[PDB]
Design a protein around this ligand. Structure first.
Ligand SMILES: [Mg+2]
Lengths: 248, 299, 402, 267, 298
């Protein structure tokens, strides 16, 4: 299968990215430095780790894949790759497998050393609950990163130059992390006569960074809808990315 | 069993018909050279051989098939212009990666690395490559597997003439094996020794297709009869004015005649017998002035 | 309803001093003569369940060593265990055991009455709405009530309009309210311990009183509730682990998330040297209760230190010395006890959470983490809060944990 | 002169950067918004500490967006090797770039703090126009100097590096270190030691950070409280006057420009 | 006598990347450097431009210092690949180099029509092709009457109509007295316009002088190509005698490498008697001269 033959490239090209390894080291140090100041000084410190991975795992995913489609078009390899025995689906889904296993390893260096810094600095942490509360944490941090991978494939296929792809990847990172929730707070403190505040626990479902925190803070909806809505953010935006990639 | 049978395509985008009634027919072993502008004359027809586009009001037939069948592109090399590969990857690793996609054997990557001459620079990063070093890398993926049709879009840009003459030696090895290739070049002098049939096309239509003897017979261009030391310059200037040929007053005892090449057989008979000469050179009209004439023939 | 002289008291001394021997008794009893009656420890004066068991109408009576059991329950007709009339001035009720479903010690109109060292176990089955008061005091001046033990009554030591009296060293466990105060101007209470109570100290509309050294261990939803207290003094109180809950009746208070101190419309009072430990709210300051001396306390372990839903500035440091805060990430360069930077306990996003509880879902967001940093960088958007210049660096209440 | 002939290019090339004009209008729409919220709340020492913090986050950002590709952006663009075959020196195509990018920062903060002053004199009725002109004149001729430090910082990290994609990593590293990491390293040194590491050395580490010397200049007379400053409350323990704080800001230019020229001289 | 490199043994990193080249260049000659893209060609290219110091050897560009600011007004250098200033215009870029080189600002309008870039002037350089930037890169090179051009691959990525027009611009500059150095790699075609070549490899300058000087210093097999012949396979058997490696590329595409002692009489073997149609006699060209001189360096 050629979905893996182009995925082994993106592991080998992604692990030699100097920009990723700087941030993934800074992600792994800050995941220890939050866990150091949450144990010596478990839901109180796993929530501060959720605010860290809402900052950096969208940023790690957008650093990997902002030049996935348009970076190959400027490099000229994209027009070459379509003349190979390869569909446009297998290039995109193979990049999603290749970039997906990178940040599925960046949480194993990120939270694999953070959960070690909790199991050896609490002295009585009751590790049967730890490896399930971090199992729900490492899985849901990959799924948050896989959304922004599919968000990066949407903005790469639309633009025609690599410089304007980073101008949209910065715009998607600003909008989906800390502009969508600031206009949720602005709909509260500035509008009260026509804004029902009961609607706002449902309005977090239009934001994959918000659905990421709700399954680390455990709510009118149950947990199982939020897992099926986080996977739905992957499946619509990957289908949206394939529809954009078929119009180059 | 023609490799490329372009049968009456009319390619268009909006109101602009970017390719008007092109009809190519590439043989099973010919080396055909597409020459034109950088714009949509050449680069749309080159994309039409590949499955990147679709014939808007015609059809193309690569190897007797449609160009988007996956069995075609398992035996269809391609090297594009100005390609920079993945710079964090390696030289051997990139060709190992492109061998996995084309269905080629992984044992074939070691001969192809040294055939193009990249064994000194394999297992090094692609960012520390030259422009000419990447062109040998991009050539080596076009020979992956056993290709039956190549498209070498500008293979000689930024290459030393040792490696350029080495490249055409690889071409003449390839076309004798039974692999008809396609050149899409801008640099014309040097390529005419190995082009089996030129395919100069301007912006609108397909201008001229034929062999090099087939163009110069049709397109009437002057041959270059340049001599030196016959007896003297003016002592044999008389024969060209009597037979009606434009002759030039060259340096010293030396005769340049830009003849009309109809009499140039019988112009060379009585010239050669009494002629001493130290150093002559008879130049036929090249690919360049043929391209210069066919550009002015269409706008 | 017989009298105390209708029993069999063996007189030890002929100066109106009596001694009741060991043995049970029955029915209500009435003291009409100044008899300093004592009792042996086997004097289980058990009533049948109706009426006030030991009514006292004569002055200067040293009631000592009785063991009372099962009096009435008519709280409207005030079926007490020890009823003390206004004419029974300077009564001493020393070291007594009581078990019954009504009022324990109901006094009214008395002066210099002494209720010392008693153990009052209220009830076990009533729903903390009809158990009756432990030590009820109704407009008494002089009431020296010291080192008693009230358990499982209704609203603990209720006090209504009593002017000058001390409450020293008494332990109050598993009751509705610990100490209730109603219009008790110029009062005092020292060193009391309240455990597992739906409000540790009810301070309603009582002025000019001294609340000193008192302890509140694991009470529910209100550590010290002060309603409309003026010119008071809160020095040395230890309020620990006020967990959430409900009073069950919602009569005078409401349910709370757990507040170690709740200041409601108290204008002037000195709140110094306290220790508010491990609650959900360290101190709740309402908007009507402003400009009072709050300096020297220890706000350690609280999940939220101050709740102040206002925009008026509130300096919390008299004479340049402030409070110790556990989450105060400050330094001390010049080696005094005080910190160098001031401490704002509340952000702007920490007061959007009080106004709108749906922001708790957004409380882990990076934008809130941005907005907590934007306030620390841009003080123009900082609403004027409840800061204190020079907060303390070390714990001042090193003795209150003992 | 040749120093102006290449300054006229960068003055006309930086102003066509659309990424520049976004975050220099963002500096303009925030400096009006802070001064209007500072007028609606009244808070005088809070509108100085918010403007000085606004130019701490943005005037290094506009300076590093301008000049991160000043040397390496011409080297990888091919036009640096061409420029040395013109009648120039390496000291003239650097000082010319410093004058050319410096007049943009002198104009990007004259728009920002210019509309900040007109949103006070047209908003706060009866304000002292003499105290307004002096305090916001001190903001104008010192946010250029903070900008010229990070302009000269960007010439250091452009001549040393050899790729523009990697130059943006160092310019992001310098912006993170001097603005909001050195303020947190000094905070964590003061919190974890509880102010007992050094009672005399710790105010002198503010002079090793030009964003903190910038904050100490504008918060000279407008001290007020202590929690409106933060880690800038160590400036009361500095015995140097305000005029030396100007001179340490010019010395941050001249050391990091002579370092920028000595690096570029062996490019 | 513009460029006079004498005795330069240029080293850096103790490598000695250029050794004892003596490259004199006249006042009207069009030189061509034809080394590789290693340290051979570009070190001598950096040395003439004055941005390098010649270790153990003098360099006299225009009879003066190579880095002196008076001679840099008389130079014009076209670099290899130059994306100039992608946010600037076409005119304002060329106006900027006019103020640097001290040329007249009225020259800027008449250079954007001398070079064919009047249609796309006052547009952004990001909206320019690779060939259009070479037209811009030539336009700054002809600025302020340059007595010494220096063109480093001047016609790569260029249309052959514009390539043929570029050399007619070059031949205009030779008559005016401006020496041109073509640091090129597009060697078929450039030998019709240079005057003296200079092939250098492994640091050492191998050969120098004109094309007739190079053929006199190096006996090369003269190539005799011929297509469209009445005979098909006879020449690959008849013409293998006197060291003639007769080779074809079709039924009749026969190239013949005579040994240049038969350069007049093998044509008498073909055109004296015999009936061909497309006769093509080349001389020893640039490439086979370049091929012979590179292998001599090993
Ligand atoms: Mg101090």
């Amino acid at each position: 299968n050629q979905v893996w033959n182009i995925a082994r490239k993106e592991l080998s090209d992604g692990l030699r990215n100097r920009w990723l390894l700087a941030i993934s080291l800074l992600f792994a140090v800050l995941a220890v430095g939050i866990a150091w100041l949450g144990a010596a000084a478990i839901p109180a410190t796993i929530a501060s780790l959720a605010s860290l991975a809402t900052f950096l795992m969208p940023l790690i995913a957008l650093l990997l894949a902002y030049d996935a489609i348009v970076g190959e078009d400027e490099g000229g390899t994209l027009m070459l790759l379509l003349t190979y025995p390869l569909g446009r689906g297998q290039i995109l889904l193979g990049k999603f497998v290749g970039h997906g296993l990178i940040l599925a390893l960046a949480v194993l260096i990120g939270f694999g050393c953070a959960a070690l810094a909790i199991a050896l600095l609490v002295e009585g942490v009751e590790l049967g609950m730890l490896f399930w509360a971090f199992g729900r944490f490492m899985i849901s941090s990959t799924l948050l990163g896989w959304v922004f991978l599919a968000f990066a494939y949407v903005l790469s296929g639309k633009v025609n130059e690599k410089s304007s792809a980073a101008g949209l990847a910065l715009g998607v990172w600003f909008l989906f992390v800390l502009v969508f929730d600031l206009v949720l707070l602005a709909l509260l403190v500035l509008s009260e006569g026509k804004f029902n505040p009961e609607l706002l626990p449902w309005l977090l479902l239009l934001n994959p960074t918000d659905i990421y925190r709700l399954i680390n803070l455990s709510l009118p909806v149950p947990a199982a809808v939020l897992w099926l809505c986080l996977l739905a953010w992957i499946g619509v935006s990957l289908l949206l990315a394939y529809a954009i990639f078929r119009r180059r | 069993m023609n490799a490329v049978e372009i049968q009456g395509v009319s390619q268009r985008y909006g109101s602009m018909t970017v390719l008007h009634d092109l009809n190519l027919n590439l043989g099973e072993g010919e080396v055909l050279g597409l020459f034109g502008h950088n714009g949509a004359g050449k680069t749309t027809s080159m994309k039409l051989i590949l499955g990147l586009l679709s014939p808007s009001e015609g059809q193309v037939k690569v190897l007797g098939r449609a160009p988007n069948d996956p069995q075609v592109r398992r035996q269809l090399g391609y090297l594009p212009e100005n390609v920079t590969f993945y710079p964090q990857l390696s030289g051997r690793e990139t060709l190992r990666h492109f061998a996995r996609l084309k269905g080629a054997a992984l044992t074939q990557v070691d001969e192809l690395l040294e055939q193009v001459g990249l064994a000194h620079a394999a297992d090094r990063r692609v960012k520390t490559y030259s422009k000419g070093m990447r062109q040998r890398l991009g050539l080596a993926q076009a020979l992956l597997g056993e290709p039956r049709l190549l498209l070498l879009d500008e293979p000689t840009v930024g290459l030393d003439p040792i490696a350029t003459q080495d490249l055409y030696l690889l071409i003449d090895r390839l076309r004798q094996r039974g692999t008809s290739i396609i050149l899409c070049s801008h640099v014309l002098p040097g390529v005419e020794a190995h082009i089996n049939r030129a395919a100069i096309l301007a912006k609108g239509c397909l201008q001229a297709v034929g062999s090099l003897s087939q163009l110069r017979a049709e397109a009437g261009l002057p041959v270059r009869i340049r001599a030196s030391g016959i007896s003297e310059r003016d002592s044999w200037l008389q024969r060209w004015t009597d037979a009606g040929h434009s002759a030039r007053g060259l340096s010293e005892s030396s005769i340049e005649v830009v003849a009309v090449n109809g009499h140039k057989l019988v112009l060379l008979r009585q010239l050669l017998g009494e002629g001493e000469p130290e150093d002559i050179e008879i130049h036929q009209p090249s690919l360049e002035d043929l391209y210069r004439y066919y550009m002015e023939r269409a706008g | 309803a017989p009298q105390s002289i209708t029993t069999l008291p063996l007189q030890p001394d002929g100066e109106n001093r009596w001694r009741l021997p060991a043995g049970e008794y029955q029915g209500q009893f009435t003291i009409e003569q100044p008899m300093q009656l004592r009792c042996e420890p086997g004097a289980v004066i058990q009533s049948q369940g109706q009426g006030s068991s030991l009514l006292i109408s004569a002055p200067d009576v040293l009631v000592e060593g009785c063991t009372l059991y099962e009096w009435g329950s008519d709280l409207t007709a005030m079926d007490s265990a020890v009823f003390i009339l206004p004419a029974a001035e300077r009564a001493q009720i020393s070291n007594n055991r009581m078990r019954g479903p009504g009022f324990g010690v109901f006094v009214d109109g008395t002066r210099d009455v002494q209720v010392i060292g008693n153990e009052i176990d209220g009830d076990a089955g009533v729903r903390s709405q009809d158990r009756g008061n432990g030590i009820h005091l109704f407009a008494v001046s002089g009431a020296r009530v010291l080192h008693n033990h009230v358990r499982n009554a209704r609203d603990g030591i209720y006090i209504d309009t009593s002017n000058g009296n001390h409450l020293e060293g008494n332990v109050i466990e598993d009751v509705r309210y610990g100490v209730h105060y109603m219009f008790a101007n110029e009062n005092s209470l020292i060193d009391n311990v309240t455990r597992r109570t739906r409000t540790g100290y009810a301070l309603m509309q009582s002025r000019k009183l001294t609340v000193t050294g008192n302890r509140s261990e694991q009470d529910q939803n209100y550590g010290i509730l002060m309603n409309y207290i003026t010119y008071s003094t809160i020095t040395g109180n230890f309020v620990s682990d006020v967990q959430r809950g409900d009073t069950g009746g919602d009569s005078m208070i409401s349910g709370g998330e757990g507040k170690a101190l709740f200041i409601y419309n108290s204008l002037f009072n000195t709140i110094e040297n306290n220790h508010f430990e491990k609650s959900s709210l360290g101190i709740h300051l309402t908007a009507g209760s402003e400009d009072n001396r709050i300096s020297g306390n220890a706000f350690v372990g609280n999940q939220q230190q101050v709740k102040y839903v206002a925009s008026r500035t509130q300096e919390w440091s008299v004479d340049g010395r402030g409070n110790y805060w556990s989450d105060y990430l400050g330094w001390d360069r010049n080696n005094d006890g005080l910190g160098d930077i001031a401490y704002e306990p509340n952000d702007n996003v920490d007061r959007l959470l009080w106004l709108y509880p749906q922001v708790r879902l957004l409380m882990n967001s990076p934008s809130i983490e941005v907005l907590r940093w934007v306030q620390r960088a841009f003080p123009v958007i900082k609403s004027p809060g409840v800061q204190d210049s020079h907060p303390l660096m070390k714990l001042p209440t090193e003795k209150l944990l003992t």
